[PDB]
């Protein structure tokens, strides 16, 4: 609410893994976040994949940037 | 296209003859004097050299 | 005037040979304090599940051993890395002249950044002992 | 085979501590068996291999950032030469020439040192 | 002829195993499904330095054609445990807790026979052998 | 038995890493199983402090993502771009590059004197730890 939300990336609590897997359906930037959070390419690429995939209006340009992000995780 | 044609192809003739024209420049292996003669006919300069080397012209030479 | 640049030729290259034979067997043996000191690192799978059956017959529980784990990970974590960045400095280093990578420019090339990079060594490495001369 | 002999010395010297915090760790273990204690070891070199590591990160984002300014460069990156090999050449034959004065430099003056103690 | 005979199942058992368990959902009842899959015990044993010795010879010493498989999964093997080695150490391991890993990376990295033979692996036309070679090293590193 | 035997130095070292990281692995368990105990603590929190910092440091934020990959992103762009320019130019000059073999060797031996110089110059050093 505080869009604090950078900080959260910080936190290392094992609380916070599940919390951001649960509330991951403005979650984009939660996503934004997620993707960013794991440091594992693995785990990022297939956020960024469902994030373009995704129903939320998200423009052709960030659905590739996620996709050209995605794929470099490759 | 040349060969399998029972027909004139002038045209195809001429294109080839630019295309060799085209590739023995670009690259260095290809180069020199058995070509100017040339300007398209199964009077191939590859064909000759084919012959007596080998078939092997070498990997796939693509335009920069 | 030939016959002598042999000589210190037959010399020099048995003391070649004296090297090699050398650094040989010492790969051996470098090599075999690598198959003891594994057999044996366990047979230190005894002494280390027995710690664990004798530890599981007891209350229970086992603790603050996480942290340690997330220690050898996160120790772990950044060899991954370094593999990673090497993984990207060979494609750089792959991305720059083309129809014939076998010539000789870029054999110059290299080995002169070898030189350089060496040259810079001895620079300041040098420059220390020079900086390092000022307490005396 | 020079080159050859670092390698070794490197061989050498590693398997030489892996022997060991091997050691610290078999007959420690061993004692335990039978009752007795080695332990903050690690504490030594768990911290000890931290501060390793330490830097190990620095050298990762030094060496990062020299990637995109070299990378950076490539960009700009983009043109023929025979005179620059020489060019190149002469100014390492100055090179080499300034830094054997550091060193003759040092060296002199650890020379100095030397002789000062007796 | 007997030796290969009975260390290829078990090669190709070790193998499953590691697969046994998807470790890419973590990356990308959970308590008892972790405790029950059988690439815990897997790791656990490897993690022995009798265990991974054996892997490793077979990769020192490489080449019937039989043979020659029991030397790709030699290879696929360490090349699954080197890739998920932080998995089981930080993951797996706390959640059914038994020792810890460090024998095996001397034993490798340091062994220097298994790091230039492994080289020596790439050039070989089998892709499976050559493909994971090269995979390894990377891991290492 | 020198061009082909780097294959037993290469392969020492990456026995003698993947041992280290057993060893490691080792020395860590026999510091939780016989150390809990529930003792633990002291000295223990400042590797711990040591170890928080490097560990998020890391994590973060910041690193990960945008360096590497706008410099993977990157990357390959510059390589797409980097073949065509190429094309051509024009062969080249390769060629000439025999020598420039040669002189460089003569650079190499000069450097290596240098550098075992200064590493006597040292020596000649601590022995000035007089």
Redesign the interface.
Same mark, same amino acid.
């Given at each position: 609410q505080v869009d604090l939300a950078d900080k959260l990336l910080q936190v290392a609590s094992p609380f916070l893994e599940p919390h951001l897997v649960r509330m991951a359906k403005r979650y984009m930037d939660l996503l934004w976040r997620y993707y960013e959070k794991?440091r594992?390419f693995?785990?990022?690429?297939?956020?960024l994949s469902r994030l373009a995939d995704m129903h939320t209006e998200i423009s052709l340009q960030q659905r590739l940037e996620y996709i050209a992000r995605a794929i470099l995780s490759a | 296209l040349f060969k399998s044609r029972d027909p004139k192809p002038l045209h195809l003739l001429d294109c080839i003859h630019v295309l060799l024209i085209r590739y023995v420049e670009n690259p260095s292996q290809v180069l020199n004097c058995e070509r100017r003669r040339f300007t398209n006919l199964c009077l191939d300069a590859v064909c000759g050299y084919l012959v007596e080397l080998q078939s092997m012209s070498s990997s796939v030479a693509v335009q920069a | 005037e030939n016959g002598e640049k042999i000589t210190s030729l037959h010399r020099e290259v048995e003391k070649v040979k004296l090297d090699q034979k050398r650094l040989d067997q010492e790969?051996d043996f470098?090599?075999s304090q690598?198959?003891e000191?594994?057999?044996?690192?366990?047979?230190?799978?005894e002494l280390?599940?027995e710690?664990?059956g004798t530890i599981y017959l007891q209350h229970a529980d086992?603790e603050r051993?996480?942290t340690?784990?997330?220690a050898?990970?996160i120790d772990?974590?950044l060899?991954?890395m370094?593999?990673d960045l090497?993984?990207i400095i060979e494609h750089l280093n792959t991305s720059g002249a083309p129809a014939d990578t076998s010539d000789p420019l870029q054999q110059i090339c290299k080995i002169l950044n070898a030189h350089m990079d060496s040259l810079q060594w001895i620079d300041q490495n040098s420059a220390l002992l020079q900086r390092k001369v000022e307490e005396v | 085979i020079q080159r050859n002999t670092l390698n070794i010395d490197k061989?050498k010297i590693?398997?030489a501590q892996?022997l060991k915090?091997?050691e610290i760790?078999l007959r420690t273990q061993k004692t335990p068996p039978g009752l007795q204690h080695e332990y903050a070891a690690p504490a030594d070199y768990f911290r000890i291999l931290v501060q390793q590591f330490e830097v190990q990160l620095q050298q990762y984002r030094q060496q990062i950032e020299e990637l995109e300014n070299h990378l950076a460069t490539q960009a700009n990156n983009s043109h023929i030469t025979p005179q620059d090999l020489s060019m190149a050449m002469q100014k390492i034959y100055q090179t080499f020439v300034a830094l054997a004065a550091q060193l003759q430099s040092i060296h002199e003056n650890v020379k100095v040192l030397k002789e000062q103690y007796l | 002829a007997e030796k290969w005979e009975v260390a290829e199942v078990v090669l190709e058992v070790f193998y499953k195993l590691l697969r046994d368990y998807e470790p890419?959902l973590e990356?990308?009842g959970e308590e008892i499904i972790a405790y029950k899959p059988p690439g815990f015990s897997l790791m656990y044993?490897l993690?022995?330095?009798?265990? =991974?010795?054996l892997a490793?010879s077979l990769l020192?010493e490489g080449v019937k054609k039989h043979l020659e498989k029991a030397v790709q999964h030699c290879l696929a093997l360490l090349n699954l445990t080197l890739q998920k080695?932080?998995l089981f150490?930080?993951l797996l391991?706390?959640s059914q =807790?038994?020792?810890? =890993?460090?024998?095996? =990376?001397?034993?490798?990295?340091?062994?220097?026979?298994?790091?230039?033979? /492994?080289?020596?692996y790439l050039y070989h036309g089998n892709p499976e052998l050559a493909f994971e070679s090269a995979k390894i090293?990377?891991? /290492?590193? | 038995n020198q061009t082909?035997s +780097?294959?037993?130095?290469?392969?020492?070292?990456?026995?003698?890493?993947?041992?280290?990281?057993?060893? %490691?692995? +080792? %020395?860590?368990?026999?510091e939780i199983?016989r150390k809990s105990g529930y003792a633990i603590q002291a000295d223990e929190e400042q590797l711990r402090v040591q170890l928080d910092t490097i560990q998020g440091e890391l994590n973060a934020p910041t690193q990960f993502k945008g360096r590497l990959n706008e410099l993977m992103s990157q990357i390959r762009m510059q390589n797409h771009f980097g073949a065509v320019r190429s094309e051509e130019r024009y062969y080249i000059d390769a060629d000439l590059l025999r020598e420039i073999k040669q002189h460089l060797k003569q650079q190499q031996e000069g450097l290596s004197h240098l550098i075992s110089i200064i590493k006597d110059d040292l020596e000649d050093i601590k022995l000035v730890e007089h």
């Amino acid at each position: 609410q505080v869009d604090l939300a950078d900080k959260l990336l910080q936190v290392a609590s094992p609380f916070l893994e599940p919390h951001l897997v649960r509330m991951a359906k403005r979650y984009m930037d939660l996503l934004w976040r997620y993707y960013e959070k794991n440091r594992s390419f693995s785990n990022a690429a297939r956020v960024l994949s469902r994030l373009a995939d995704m129903h939320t209006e998200i423009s052709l340009q960030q659905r590739l940037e996620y996709i050209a992000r995605a794929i470099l995780s490759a | 296209l040349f060969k399998s044609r029972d027909p004139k192809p002038l045209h195809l003739l001429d294109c080839i003859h630019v295309l060799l024209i085209r590739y023995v420049e670009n690259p260095s292996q290809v180069l020199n004097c058995e070509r100017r003669r040339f300007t398209n006919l199964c009077l191939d300069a590859v064909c000759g050299y084919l012959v007596e080397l080998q078939s092997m012209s070498s990997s796939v030479a693509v335009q920069a | 005037e030939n016959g002598e640049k042999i000589t210190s030729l037959h010399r020099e290259v048995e003391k070649v040979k004296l090297d090699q034979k050398r650094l040989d067997q010492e790969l051996d043996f470098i090599l075999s304090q690598q198959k003891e000191l594994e057999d044996l690192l366990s047979p230190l799978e005894e002494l280390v599940k027995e710690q664990s059956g004798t530890i599981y017959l007891q209350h229970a529980d086992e603790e603050r051993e996480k942290t340690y784990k997330l220690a050898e990970n996160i120790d772990a974590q950044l060899k991954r890395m370094a593999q990673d960045l090497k993984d990207i400095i060979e494609h750089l280093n792959t991305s720059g002249a083309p129809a014939d990578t076998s010539d000789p420019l870029q054999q110059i090339c290299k080995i002169l950044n070898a030189h350089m990079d060496s040259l810079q060594w001895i620079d300041q490495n040098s420059a220390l002992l020079q900086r390092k001369v000022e307490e005396v | 085979i020079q080159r050859n002999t670092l390698n070794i010395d490197k061989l050498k010297i590693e398997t030489a501590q892996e022997l060991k915090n091997a050691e610290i760790a078999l007959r420690t273990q061993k004692t335990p068996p039978g009752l007795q204690h080695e332990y903050a070891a690690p504490a030594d070199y768990f911290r000890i291999l931290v501060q390793q590591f330490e830097v190990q990160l620095q050298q990762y984002r030094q060496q990062i950032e020299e990637l995109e300014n070299h990378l950076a460069t490539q960009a700009n990156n983009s043109h023929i030469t025979p005179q620059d090999l020489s060019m190149a050449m002469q100014k390492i034959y100055q090179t080499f020439v300034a830094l054997a004065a550091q060193l003759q430099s040092i060296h002199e003056n650890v020379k100095v040192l030397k002789e000062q103690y007796l | 002829a007997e030796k290969w005979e009975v260390a290829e199942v078990v090669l190709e058992v070790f193998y499953k195993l590691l697969r046994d368990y998807e470790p890419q959902l973590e990356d990308f009842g959970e308590e008892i499904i972790a405790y029950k899959p059988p690439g815990f015990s897997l790791m656990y044993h490897l993690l022995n330095e009798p265990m =991974l010795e054996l892997a490793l010879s077979l990769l020192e010493e490489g080449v019937k054609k039989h043979l020659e498989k029991a030397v790709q999964h030699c290879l696929a093997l360490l090349n699954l445990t080197l890739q998920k080695e932080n998995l089981f150490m930080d993951l797996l391991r706390e959640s059914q =807790l038994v020792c810890p =890993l460090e024998q095996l =990376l001397q034993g490798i990295n340091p062994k220097a026979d298994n790091v230039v033979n /492994i080289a020596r692996y790439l050039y070989h036309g089998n892709p499976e052998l050559a493909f994971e070679s090269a995979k390894i090293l990377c891991c /290492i590193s | 038995n020198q061009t082909t035997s +780097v294959a037993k130095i290469a392969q020492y070292k990456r026995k003698l890493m993947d041992l280290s990281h057993r060893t %490691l692995q +080792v %020395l860590i368990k026999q510091e939780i199983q016989r150390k809990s105990g529930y003792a633990i603590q002291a000295d223990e929190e400042q590797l711990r402090v040591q170890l928080d910092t490097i560990q998020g440091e890391l994590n973060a934020p910041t690193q990960f993502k945008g360096r590497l990959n706008e410099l993977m992103s990157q990357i390959r762009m510059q390589n797409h771009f980097g073949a065509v320019r190429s094309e051509e130019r024009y062969y080249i000059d390769a060629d000439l590059l025999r020598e420039i073999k040669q002189h460089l060797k003569q650079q190499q031996e000069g450097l290596s004197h240098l550098i075992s110089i200064i590493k006597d110059d040292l020596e000649d050093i601590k022995l000035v730890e007089h």
